Amino acid sequence: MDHAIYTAMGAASQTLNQQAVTASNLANASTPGFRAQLNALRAVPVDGLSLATRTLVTASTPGADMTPGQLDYTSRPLDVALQQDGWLVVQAADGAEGYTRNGNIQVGPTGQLTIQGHPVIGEGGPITVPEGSEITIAADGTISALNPGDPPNTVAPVGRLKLVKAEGNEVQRSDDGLFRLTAEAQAERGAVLAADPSIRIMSGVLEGSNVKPVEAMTDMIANARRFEMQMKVITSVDENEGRANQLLSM
């Protein structure tokens, strides 16, 4: 054939990949502490002899969007929201250290703090709270525990949440949705991120997802139009080859 069909076909398939990324972003429009994935087409030119005429296209995801999200006021002392460019630290699935923005902190029957089922990490490691005690979280992450039955004079600090500062260019979303330091950024900032004392959190507010609707809509419209354009090129190339095959007769 004329491999021009293999260019428009790639452009049509990567458009479906982009649509699958955008639809995934739209599905998580209500996920607490969600970071939308950025999608971008990139052109790769095929090198060779003689005339460079073919340039294929692939969909890539250049990190995520770190724009602080919406803040819903839920009058719950455990749901916390972070200052812009600030991350909470939890223990990842494989016993590693991961970063998140979901402040929906839950207390188990044994007293351990968890986020989405992952243990919460402080300066002393995972945080264990006295069993069945009221928890208040300060602006700088200090945790006060009140034991029921005892007077409010008993309120004393227990542990401090680990709050780190990381930009978009330094973190990469792992396969389980937890952000981790990229290789270059890890090599310069060390393996574990030191807690930043300047990070402030707000207790009683939960951060929503930063999925922008207007950009999503425009992206879907553009993707549909591009897919139709590639289909019209594919049809034209197929029609051309069908007659060109007549040259072999007689």
């Binding site: 095929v46 090198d47 060779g48 294929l56």
Partner: peptide
């Protein structure tokens, strides 16, 4: 040589890098 002609040696391998090293 000119395109469509005959040469004495094979064309070099064709590769498209997504990101240059």
């Amino acid at each position: 040589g000119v395109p469509g002609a005959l040469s004495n040696q094979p064309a070099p391998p064709n590769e498209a890098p997504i990101a240059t090293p």
